[PDB]
């Protein structure tokens, strides 16, 4: 039985199937993510270096669920028109659980065939894993700003960028108070 359960299991009829998908997709798409020992563990998860592989998968499914809470409030249909352009001069549309866009997402190998695919919760969550797998492994940390540049998941998601706002403060608090982390 698990030590940590993601927040979508409380909010959504299919939440247990989302968890099952994420645990399997982490083996295929997150192997680099799951090998990092992050430089900001003292902030996010003080006991990170003691966690088993199974415990690290539980941790990352929980953190992804906290990001979903603040990006979409668990609404796979959500779309939002941004204030900046794509490469063709049309405003970017952010979509689905983690508010990913088709041009930026497909540069990570997400393979979205059409805009409808970003509203598929399983494809959306797998793309989030690919984005974390690249930046957390390249930068060696979960988030933060170093020498003027955002690092880790904060490269892509505003909710992971430090500041005096409810999303960031809540994600950090919930992470660091998990029983496995404290």
- The total of structural domains in the chain comes to 1
In a domain, 1, yes or no: no
What's the CA gap between 142 and 60, in Å, rounded? 11
> Residue 47: inside a domain, yes or no?
yes
Per the structure, the complete domain to which residue 112 belongs is given by 8-176
> What resolution in Å is listed for this PDB structure?
1.3
Residue with tokens 């997402």: 105
Q: What CA–CA distance (Å, rounded) separates 180 from 182?
A: 6
Whether residue 12 lies inside any domain: the answer is yes
Asked whether residue 181 is domain-assigned, the answer is no
29, 89 contact by CB (below 8 A):
no
CB atoms within 10 A of CB 99: 24
Give backbone dihedrals phi and psi of 20, rounded to 5 degrees, phi first. Answer: -55, -45
How many of the other CB atoms lie within 10 Å of CB of 121? 24
Q: Flag whether 182 is in a domain.
A: no
Q: In 3D, which of 37, 40, 39, 4 has the Cα closest to residue 22?
A: 4
In this structure, the number of other CB atoms found within 10 A of the CB of residue 122 comes to 16
Q: Is residue 2 part of a domain?
A: no
């Amino acid at each position: 039985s698990r030590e940590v359960i993601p927040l979508w299991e409380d909010k959504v009829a299919d939440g247990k199937a989302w968890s099952t998908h994420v645990y399997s997709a982490l083996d295929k798409l997150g192997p680099n993510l799951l090998d990092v020992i992050p430089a900001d563990r003292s902030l996010f998860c003080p006991k990170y270096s003691s966690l088993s592989y199974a415990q690290r998968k539980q941790y990352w499914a929980f953190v992804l669920s906290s990001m979903v809470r603040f990006e979409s409030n668990f609404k796979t249909a959500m779309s939002y028109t941004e204030d900046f352009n794509d490469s063709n001069g049309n405003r970017v549309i952010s979509r689905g659980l983690l508010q990913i866009s088709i041009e930026s997402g497909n540069a990570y190998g997400c393979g979205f065939k059409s805009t409808k695919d970003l509203h598929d919760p399983l494809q959306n969550l797998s793309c989030g894993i690919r984005i974390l797998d690249r930046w957390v492994s390249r930068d060696g940390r979960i988030a933060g700003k170093v020498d003027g540049a955002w690092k880790g998941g904060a490269r892509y998601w505003s909710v992971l960028r430090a500041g005096d706002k409810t999303s960031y403060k809540s994600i950090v608090s919930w992470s660091q108070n998990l029983s496995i982390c404290k």
